[PDB]
């Protein structure tokens, strides 16, 4: 019992029938849910100190299934650039046409590649002029450049965060009687039980800093958590600095795919050129986050079967439990104790509605009941015995002025002789 609460006296009402007593739970109790794998017990206190019962609430697992939100695609890519230098005032290499380049216009130096639906950009770097650079004009030449992006791997990866995290709580209930059942509780769910019902008063379980966590999916392999929330806009130096709509778009490096600006660095060396990119290899990021992980006290594992993403608590659970009790009865008390009884007096009348009052002196070591039948089996007696000596009395109906009846009393079940006797009186 990781967390123990005693059953309040306010919701509890009990009554003694001798020997044992039955208490009736009627009310509502609020208890902190036990940690993962632990129990959250409710101790029922009876009239005696030795009378105790337990309602044990084991926590099987706290599952947080993900409802996915924003999502982009990505893959590996490599830059390849094409270069063709022309001296000043040659071709497109005129007064200011170089430095005033536009990234979307393909140069006439590259009017042979044909049509491309691939991500691409255009540059123009001014190199040294003069006869030292094979140009008649001392003015700067123009190294026209046509670069694009091609996919490295023939596979893509889907990225996403989670708009919402649905909490399912599996519990194993052990009733007071010992019967066991297993249910599942959502934040607004209300399950019924043998003793009443149960629901979640308060559910705070969820991913703290879900706005500081994102996730990746490799189709048909698994998932991966990134130590960083979702980037809704392509940021350079991050996962998804380049992103597309579909898988095929990533594989095709199609020009519809978005990308951050200035991803490709250039080293224009006269006629030579080296275009490079320092991209975040998303296939490395996935391996680092190969699905089984631990952040905070949550172990992120994949959905058994139909693939999705779930989180499992490891320790404490931030949720209250409403235990509604609908006058549910629970028993049981101690064994019956042997009882010594002696006849005191028989005072009363015969055949009258008032009847006769018989008194006995009963002695026991615990609260009990005394049961005595007469030889005829016509009249029987029931009186409470107690931890000590007490004088009990009830009503007994006779029909003969001279009484001398031998009974057989027993608290523990072993009949023992007692002789009642008395002179009954008339009423008229």
Curated annotation (Swiss-Prot):
UniProt topology in membrane: Single-pass type I membrane protein
Lineage, uppermost ranks: Viruses, Riboviria, Orthornavirae, Negarnaviricota, Polyploviricotina
Subunit record text: Heterodimer with glycoprotein C.
Parent-record interval covered: 691 to 1118 of 1197
Lineage top rank: taxon: Viruses
Glycosylation sites: 104, 345, 387
The gene coding this protein: GP
Lumenal side: 1-428
Disulfide bond entries: 1-41, 14-23, 66-162, 81-275, 87-135, 93-142, 98-124, 128-133, 244-257, 339-411, 349-352, 359-393
Chain's role: Structural component of the virion that interacts with glycoprotein N. Acts as a class II fusion protein that is activated upon acidification and subsequent repositioning of the glycoprotein N. The glycoprotein protrusions are arranged on an icosahedral lattice, with T=12 triangulation. They are able to attach the virion to the host cell receptor CD209/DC-SIGN and to promote fusion of membranes with the late endosome after endocytosis of the virion.
Region annotation (Fusion loop) ranges: 87-93, 129-140
Intracellular or extracellular location(s): Virion membrane; Host Golgi apparatus membrane
UniProt-recorded name of the protein: Glycoprotein C
Post-translational modification: Glycosylated. The glycans can attach to host CD209/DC-SIGN, and may play a role in virus entry into dendritic cells.
């Amino acid at each position: 019992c990781s967390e123990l609460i005693q059953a309040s006296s306010r919701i509890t009402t009990c009554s003694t029938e001798g020997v044992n007593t039955k208490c009736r739970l009627s009310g509502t109790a609020l208890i902190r849910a036990g940690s993962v794998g632990a129990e959250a017990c409710l101790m029922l206190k009876g009239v005696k100190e030795d009378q105790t019962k337990f309602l044990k609430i084991k926590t099987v697992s706290s599952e947080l299934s993900c409802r996915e939100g924003q999502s982009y695609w990505t893959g590996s890519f490599s830059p390849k650039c094409l270069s063709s230098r022309r001296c000043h005032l040659v071709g497109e290499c005129h007064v200011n046409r170089c430095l005033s380049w536009r990234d979307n216009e393909t140069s006439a130096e590259f009017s042979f590649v044909g049509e491309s639906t691939t991500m691409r950009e255009n540059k123009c770097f001014e190199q040294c002029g003069g006869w030292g650079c094979g140009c008649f004009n001392v003015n700067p030449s123009c190294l026209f450049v046509h670069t694009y992006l091609q996919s490295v791997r023939k596979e893509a990866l889907r990225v996403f965060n989670c708009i919402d995290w649905v909490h399912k709580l599996t519990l194993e209930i052990t009733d007071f009687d010992g019967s066991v059942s297993t249910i599942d509780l959502g934040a607004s769910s209300s399950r019924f039980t043998n003793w009443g019902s149960v629901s979640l008063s308060l559910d705070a379980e969820g991913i703290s800093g879900s706005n500081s966590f994102s996730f990746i999916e490799s189709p048909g392999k698994g998932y991966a958590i990134v130590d960083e929330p979702f980037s809704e806009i392509p940021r350079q130096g991050f996962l998804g600095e380049i992103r597309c709509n579909s898988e095929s778009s990533v594989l095709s490096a199609h020009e519809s795919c978005l990308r951050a600006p200035n991803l490709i660095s250039y080293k224009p060396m006269i006629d030579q050129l080296e275009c490079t990119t320092n991209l975040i290899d998303p296939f490395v990021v996935f391996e680092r986050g190969s699905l089984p992980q631990t952040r905070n006290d949550k172990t992120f594992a994949a959905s058994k079967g139909n693939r999705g993403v779930q989180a499992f608590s490891k320790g404490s659970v931030q949720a209250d439990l409403t235990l509604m009790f609908d006058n549910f009865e629970v028993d049981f008390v101690g064994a019956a104790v042997s009882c010594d009884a002696a006849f005191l007096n028989l005072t009363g009348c015969y055949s009258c509605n008032a009847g006769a009052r018989v008194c006995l002196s009963i002695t026991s070591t615990g609260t009990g009941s005394l049961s005595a039948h007469n030889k005829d089996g016509s009249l029987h007696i029931v009186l409470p015995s107690e931890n000590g000596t007490k004088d009990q009395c009830q009503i007994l109906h006779f029909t003969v002025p001279e009484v001398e009846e031998e009974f057989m009393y027993s608290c523990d079940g072993d009949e023992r002789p007692l002789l009642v006797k008395g002179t009954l009186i008339a009423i008229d």
